[PDB]
């Protein structure tokens, strides 16, 4: 999280339920003005800080991009490790072959994948109660009203809904008394049968759906520009038409791509599983469909031949078994 700091330069103190004091570090980024950051992985940074007793200063990314190959050169966060403006990357950054040939990754924080987020627009009382269905109701009562003294005139209406002799007519009424039951019995199951029509909410079941492989102008697909999902779709020749024309709808950041979905302006959003699932919990009006298809994790990137290669990948590996990475999970991700 990134929030502006107070007037005095130290941002406001928060106390989640019991919680203990919330841990906040002063981020200095975009000109440039200081801020303060709350963090899931920042609570992980402060843990690594005390173990190897190294001090730190945190500054935001210059351009807000994750990183990819330009033209011959890297951009975003990767453009600041190689150059020398940073010695570590504490942010959700997936592991893949292209990045692994230039930096070192350690072991993942958490294991996840990536999915697709779409609208969850999920909305008659008696739809068939019209046309001949309603017309036949009036005809039956009117015909029997003068079938044959006025006591039986209201009898037909009352006998239709529970309740309130002329020999042949008495038997005729008796046999017709059960006739009202069968006709209304179908009505009871008519709406019951009409209650299971449902709607096609299975808009996109993974990549292998025919809509993705054959994109139509009705559907608009998007991701975040210069990220790992962009790389994943430029590795496969059979998907050369996937983003041949759907590349121009790529969004700048995942913060505003989700807002586009809720504005009925975007139809599909492909991004990390650990992020979209959390958003679906808060919003309570979106949904994630499909299945995970590229399983990797978030690791601490650090420049090649760095002398902290073994230290970091052991504390992360130990923290899973202590339960520390589960205490963070409940306080930050899976609560509601």
């Amino acid at each position: 999280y990134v929030k502006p700091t107070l007037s005095d330069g130290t941002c406001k103190e928060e106390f989640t339920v019991n919680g203990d004091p919330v841990k906040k570090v002063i981020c200095t980024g975009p000109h440039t003005v200081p801020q303060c950051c709350y963090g899931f992985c920042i609570d992980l940074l402060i843990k690594l800080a005390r173990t190897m007793n190294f001090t730190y200063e945190v500054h935001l990314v210059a351009d807000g991009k994750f990183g990819t190959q330009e033209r011959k050169e890297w951009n975003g966060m990767m453009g600041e490790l190689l150059s020398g403006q940073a010695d570590m990357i504490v942010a959700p950054l997936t592991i893949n072959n292209e990045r692994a040939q230039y930096i070192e990754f350690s072991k993942p924080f958490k294991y996840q994948g990536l999915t697709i987020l779409v609208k969850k627009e999920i909305p008659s009382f008696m739809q068939p109660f019209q046309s001949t269905l309603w017309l036949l109701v009036g005809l039956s009562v009117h015909v029997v009203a003068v079938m044959l003294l006025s006591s039986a005139m209201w009898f037909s209406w009352g006998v239709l809904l529970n309740s309130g002799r002329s020999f042949s007519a008495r038997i005729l009424g008796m046999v017709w008394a059960g006739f009202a039951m069968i006709i209304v019995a179908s009505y009871t199951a008519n709406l019951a049968a009409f209650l299971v029509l449902d709607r096609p909410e299975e808009r996109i079941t993974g990549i292998n759906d025919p809509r993705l492989r054959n994109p139509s102008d009705k559907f608009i697909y998007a991701t975040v520009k210069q990220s790992s999902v962009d790389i994943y779709f430029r590795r496969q020749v059979e998907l050369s038409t996937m983003y041949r024309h759907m590349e121009k709808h790529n969004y700048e950041s995942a913060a505003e791509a989700i807002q586009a979905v809720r504005d009925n302006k975007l139809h599909a959003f492909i991004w990390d599983s650990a992020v979209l699932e959390f958003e679906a919990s808060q919003k309570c009006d979106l949904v994630t469909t499909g299945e995970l298809f590229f399983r990797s994790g978030f690791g601490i990137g650090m420049r090649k031949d760095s002398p902290w290669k073994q230290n970091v990948s052991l504390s992360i590996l130990k923290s899973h078994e202590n339960g520390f990475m589960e205490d963070l999970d409940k306080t930050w991700v899976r609560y509601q």
Binding site: P128, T132, L133, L136, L139, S140, V143, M147, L172, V175, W176, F179, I182, I183, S186
Partner: peptide, 17 residues
């Protein structure tokens, strides 16, 4: 719902005859 009217028609002819 053509069958539903058929039952009524059969019912109507039942008492009429």
């Amino acid at each position: 719902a053509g069958v539903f009217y058929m039952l009524l028609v059969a019912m109507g002819l039942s008492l009429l005859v």
